């Protein structure tokens, strides 16, 4: 079925993008990569940098996710990304979402061998 | 399965929208519209208009089809269109369109009962 290695690049991953805040970016790129089905997904995260500076988060500094119990990532520098949240209005199947830009440090959770990004866990900065 | 009167209305109705311009309006749409599974579609036309009066289309103008012959009809005004094409160098999976807005009037073939648009078959003016 679905790697964790895809569903974390068909779900985090824009390599070349660059959205204006709340434009509909989210909205289309939800629909298009398929959170938007059954039910809506409530926020989601993309981020803007390169798959390959994406997975070396992967050998970055070592945290713990939010949990408070897994091993994660921060990425050493901040990257570009954009934050997807749900409107209160929306009702599924009518999916909105809030769109916005902003540049932080990303965490993720690693794993599989190629070891690679598998969960994208929060931002900061 | 899906009526062709649904389908129509996914493929090229978005009268909340008015795209830009080579935007990524059109790559986006394709994608979350469904016209990028398994072959990238060639082109595309989305209207800008409200449902209603793109309907009402079908009680308009009639005229022949392009080449598929069954009851076209063709707006009597000019709408806002926004043309989506793959550009050359576009190879699926990642397929890229040009976005081209513009305001033509607009022909659809008509069918079923109701009498709703069912293909879009052309643009004039």
Do not use: W
């Not at 997975?55 to 996710?65: D, R, S």
């Not at 999916?95 to 916005?100: F, W």
């Not at 902003?102 to 990004?117: D, F, L, M, N, T």
Request: hydrophobic content about 25%; charged content about 20%.
């Amino acid at each position: 079925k679905e790697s964790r290695a895809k569903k974390f690049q068909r779900q985090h991953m824009d390599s070349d993008s660059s959205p204006s805040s709340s434009s509909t970016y989210c909205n289309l790129m939800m629909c298009c990569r398929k959170m938007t089905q059954g039910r809506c997904k409530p926020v989601n995260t993309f981020v803007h940098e390169p798959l390959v500076d994406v997975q070396n988060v992967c050998f970055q500094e070592k945290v713990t996710c939010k949990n408070g119990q897994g091993n994660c990532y921060k990425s050493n520098s901040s990257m570009h990304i954009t934050d997807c949240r749900l409107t209160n209005g929306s009702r599924y199947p009518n999916c909105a979402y809030r769109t916005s830009p902003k540049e932080r440090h990303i965490i993720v959770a690693c794993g599989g061998s190629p070891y690679v990004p598998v969960h994208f866990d929060a931002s900061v900065e």
